[PDB]
Amino acid sequence: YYRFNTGPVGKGPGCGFWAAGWRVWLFFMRGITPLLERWLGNLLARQFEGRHSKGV
RNA sequence: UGGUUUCUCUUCAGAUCGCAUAAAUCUUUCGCCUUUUACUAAAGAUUUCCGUGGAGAGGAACAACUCUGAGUCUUAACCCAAUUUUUUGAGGCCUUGC
Ligand SMILES: O=P(O)(O)O[C@H]1[C@H](OP(=O)(O)O)[C@@H](OP(=O)(O)O)[C@H](OP(=O)(O)O)[C@@H](OP(=O)(O)O)[C@H]1OP(=O)(O)O
Ligand SMILES: [Mg+2]
Q1: CA of A32 vs C1' of B20, distance in Å?
Q2: What CA–CA distances, in Å, run from A39 to A35, A45, A48?
């Protein structure tokens, strides 16, 4: 925004440069994918296999 | 002495790259601090995921070929006659050695 709102261009909304935040949130997904695949796999495996009482 | 786009599989590659950058586990300190998660911010040890490269094999061509550029019997007209070279100052004779 400091580079965007420099001269005659004011301080309205008017700024879609979503590439930076887009990269930031996709690099979040890059690492959250194993964690959520493991967590959702255990969720589905407990729902369809049952809970093991004193197994571990 | 002479010819590649795409799909899959296998294998080997991360001591200067993937000129980009996430998460997790352990162990040790921490930092807050009702306890457990969920966390702070460092060191270390390890892993997973999104990507990548080299080689080989096979498939799908929707590219087109062999007097052709380069020959082991064709094909760069120029390495082809005045003192330094591929055109003789040559010619003649005689003695020595088993
Ligand atoms: O109000 P300020 O503290 O001056 O800052 C605001 C705020 O952004 P910050 O997060 O940097 O404060 C606004 O964001 P909101 O949280 O209010 O949504 C933003 O507007 P948008 O983010 O909605 O675009 C706006 O930007 P601007 O007013 O330039 O359009 C920006 O103002 P400043 O840039 O003047 O700080
Ligand atoms: Mg209790």
Answers
A1: 18
A2: 6, 10, 14
Q: How many CA atoms lie within 13 A of A20 on its CB side?
A: 4
Solved how? cryo-EM
Cα–Cα distance measured from residue A54 to residue A11, given in angstroms and rounded to the nearest whole number = 61
User: For residue A42, how far is its CA from the centre of ligand 1 (angstroms)?
Assistant: 41
**What is the 3-state secondary structure of A3-34?**
CCCCCCCCCCCCCCCCHHHHHHHHHHHHHHHH
Quick one: which of A38, A1, A43 has its CA closest to A21? A1
Resolution of the experimentally solved model in angstroms: 2.9
Residue A6 CA to residue A2 CA, distance in Å, equals 6
